[PDB]
């Protein structure tokens, strides 16, 4: 039955290897009974430390934002101009210089159960964002399911948002305010949406949200789910598994955390919500849910720019070897730097 020739036709071979490797490894980590092999997961994941030394124009450092839960976030900044020596542990929080300095609060993907801020795929993505958008990036190492299910991820994002917004050294000179943009791929995009909702209800002004192949769902089986099931790295079976691991016991996929436009979700009509850049991979099996999300925002009168990449698959933004990556990075920069 197994035949992966079809998926190889739409992506570069090395990309196919990277995503397929995660696919097979994750098959092992997820157990039929709902448990997760966390020890093996963290052993297999490829990680990297922070580095105060600028590499390719970017340096980074980790910060403990909440001890009770050991919540870490990695800060990525462009190399300091005219620095004669590398940053010491006392030079990491030097005030940003610039009339307007965008700060992207990023949430990695992994369907709520996989990866960390220090996972190589995400450390690389964040470093690329710093260089391509000429901004500061703060990547949240939010807690993962099933051990720390809903609402842990959202709570961690909220804590990180307040931390970022309260950093005097991240204030832009123009208006003495931290210009915050929420961003995330997969489950990270979902977290960004929900953190934004909470921000608008607390007075914290988020300037924009960037969702890459955001993870949303619902009780219904969309046409894209039925037609693309297992064809491009993802199966409905594993989607169901991650939702069950993240959502409260006894809940279904119409819970607002899964379906932001569920009858149970609060209306966004007449609500102060940031402008959004929604990127949808055409070959992502949950494409229909993502398109429905973008339409939901538009229908609620929210500002939304939709990028529907017809032949893109999940993970297209992990390697700079395709036009989806280039096109998207161009729009992200324009989005965060727009007036």
């Amino acid at each position: 039955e197994v035949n992966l020739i079809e998926s190889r036709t739409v992506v570069p071979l090395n990309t196919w290897v990277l995503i397929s490797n995660f696919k097979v490894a994750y098959n092992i980590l997820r157990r039929p009974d709902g448990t997760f092999n966390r020890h093996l997961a963290e052993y297999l994941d490829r990680k990297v430390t922070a580095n105060a030394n600028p590499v390719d124009g970017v340096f980074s450092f980790d910060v403990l934002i909440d001890r009770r839960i050991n919540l870490l976030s990695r800060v990525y900044r462009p190399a300091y101009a005219d620095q004669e020596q590398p940053p010491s542990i006392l030079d990491l929080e030097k005030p940003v210089d610039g009339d307007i300095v965008p700060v992207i609060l990023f949430f990695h993907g992994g369907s709520f159960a996989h990866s960390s801020a220090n996972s190589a795929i995400y450390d690389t993505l964040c470093r690329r964002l710093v260089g391509l958008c000429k901004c500061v990036v703060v990547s949240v190492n939010y807690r993962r399911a099933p051990e720390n299910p809903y609402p842990c991820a959202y709570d961690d994002g909220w804590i990180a948002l307040n931390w970022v917004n309260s950093r005097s050294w991240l204030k832009s000179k123009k208006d003495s305010k931290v210009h915050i943009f929420l961003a995330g791929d997969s489950s990270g995009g979902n977290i960004a949406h929900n953190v934004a909702l909470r921000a608008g209800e607390s007075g914290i002004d988020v300037l924009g949200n960037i969702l890459l192949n955001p993870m949303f769902g619902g009780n219904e089986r969309t046409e894209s789910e039925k037609s693309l099931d297992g064809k491009y790295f993802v199966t409905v079976r594993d989607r169901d598994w991650y939702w069950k691991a993240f959502l409260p016991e006894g809940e279904d996929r119409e819970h607002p955390a899964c379906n932001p436009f569920s009858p149970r979700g609060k209306s966004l009509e007449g609500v102060s919500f940031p402008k959004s850049l929604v990127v949808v991979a055409g070959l992502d099996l949950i494409r229909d849910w993502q398109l429905a999300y973008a339409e939901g925002l538009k229908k609620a009168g929210q500002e939304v720019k939709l990028m529907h990449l017809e032949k893109a698959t999940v993970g297209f933004y992990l390697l700079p070897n395709n036009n989806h990556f280039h096109n998207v990075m161009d729009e992200i920069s324009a989005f965060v730097n727009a007036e």
Partner: protein, 60 residues
Amino acid sequence: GMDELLAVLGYKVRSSEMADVAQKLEQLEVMMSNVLATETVHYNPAELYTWLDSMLTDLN
């Protein structure tokens, strides 16, 4: 010649062996669809070629 785009992501794969690694991934999916992980922790996860080869053996 190693693939530098994968190397930055933590994986060591020779560009000339990319197709072979791709083949092994599929062969492993095949076995999994016909099916442990205790021995997995002993293998080097960065070396995809050998990692997959070792896993293929553990199965079968």
